[PDB]
Amino acid sequence: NSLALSLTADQMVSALLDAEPPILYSEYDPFSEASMMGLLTNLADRELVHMINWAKRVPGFVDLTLHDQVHLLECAWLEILMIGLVWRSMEHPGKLLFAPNLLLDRNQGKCVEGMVEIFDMLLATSSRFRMMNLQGEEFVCLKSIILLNSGVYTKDHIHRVLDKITDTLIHLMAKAGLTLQQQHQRLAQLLLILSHIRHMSNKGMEHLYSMKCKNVVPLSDLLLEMLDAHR
């Protein structure tokens, strides 16, 4: 049996908030094509190491086989990076806070071909969380859901942990004073945003593993192995 199911809602929140990865910094130094590629690649490469240790602290994730853990991370790693970027940028409308020393807007995504489209989608998601007044306890639930859900069809244990996180989200909204109607409405609103986050990841991954973008930059071996997973 898994320990994650015996936890309570506040215990689930507490464990998720405590497992949060740190906010990393970018290199210190106008951006061109390769410089922005090197800056974002170096940042995401260092975040992945904190993400893997964060994943092991998501309740129920450790109970998976080592293969299942590898597969979920390979499927959802860019989704997890985006919802973190979107979360960090909530307080900065029109700007993407990649790092505390790296705020970018639309025009900075223009020096990389095709990246403006996804910047716009990321800015729209961040503004959407802002207008929803997304709380941190809701954020850590959504990000863990992304980790467990995105690779669940490519078994029964994951779905009862997903049920557990759903109870937690509703427990947070009821604790916030939302009515029964506002509870399941807000629940649906947050989960439909995950479909868009999946869409941004697919469109963004499509550029990453393109042979052109693959040869512009020294992508790390780890970032290549995470990229080859989407063969």
């Binding site: 092991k56 080592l66 590898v70 192995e225």
Partner: peptide, 10 residues
């Protein structure tokens, strides 16, 4: 034969 295996075990 995969970096992800090692980081998940350490």
């Amino acid at each position: 034969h995969k970096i992800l295996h090692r980081l998940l075990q350490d």
